[PDB]
Ligand binder design. Structure first.
Ligand SMILES: Cc1[nH]c(C(=O)Nc2nc3cc(O)c(C(=O)O)cc3s2)c(Cl)c1Cl
Length: 192
């Protein structure tokens, strides 16, 4: 717990070092790319077939995959869900995105259950919890970048995300990638 909080603090103290320039939009868009890269890893492993990337009307971004779902069982050493360990302990890792997010929402569908957890600046608000039943599997991460970290360029650029997602669809030809902008209704579907 003290180690977790110190590691998150290490990322916040030197955020450009972990995520890229925090003033010119590079780091901001790399936050999305890190989350997408985890979904792509789940596609490379043979589990994920579709990835949905949403720019919400409030300039948060979500990434949904249909992979296995991050494991949810208690990780013995930490006494918290494996998912929480992945989200909070230091491809820079999704924990960097969590550390640099004012808020992050995690929803996992796995082993017949839906699980949800909220973080603020990487601090879990409650233990991962069951919210219902599902026959689906996958992982959804929605994050609200911290305005204490990201300056000047704070709004996501549809075209920057679209170009990278098109590249990833070409390089992962089986994967379907959807991009949706809730700010204006724009959407794209990349599937080689
Ligand atoms: C959008 C997004 N998706 C992910 C993701 O699917 N990561 C996952 N990691 C693991 C690790 C595992 O050991 C297992 C298992 O053994 O079944 C399953 C998964 S799924 C992450 Cl992380 C993020 Cl971020």
């Amino acid at each position: 717990s003290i180690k977790v909080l110190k590691g998150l603090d290490a990322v916040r103290k030197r955020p450009g070092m972990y995520i890229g320039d925090t003033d010119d939009g590079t780091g901001l868009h790399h936050m999305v790319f890190e989350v997408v890269d985890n979904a792509i890893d789940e596609a490379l492993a043979g589990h994920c077939k579709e990835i949905i990337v949403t720019i919400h009307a409030d300039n948060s971004v979500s990434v949904q995959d249909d992979g296995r779902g991050i494991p949810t069982g208690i990780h013995p050493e930490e006494g918290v869900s494996a998912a929480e360990v992945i989200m909070t302990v230091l491809g820079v890792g999704v924990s960097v995105v969590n550390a640099l997010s004012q808020k992050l929402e995690l929803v996992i569908q796995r082993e017949g259950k839906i699980h949800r957890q909220i973080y603020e600046h990487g601090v879990p608000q409650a233990p991962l919890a069951v919210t219902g039943e599902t026959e689906k599997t996958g992982t959804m991460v929605r994050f609200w970048p911290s305005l204490e970290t990201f300056t000047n360029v704070t709004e996501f650029e549809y075209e920057i995300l679209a170009k990278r997602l098109r590249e990833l669809s070409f390089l992962n030809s089986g994967v379907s990638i959807r991009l949706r902008d809730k700010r204006d209704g724009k959407e794209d579907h990349f599937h080689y």
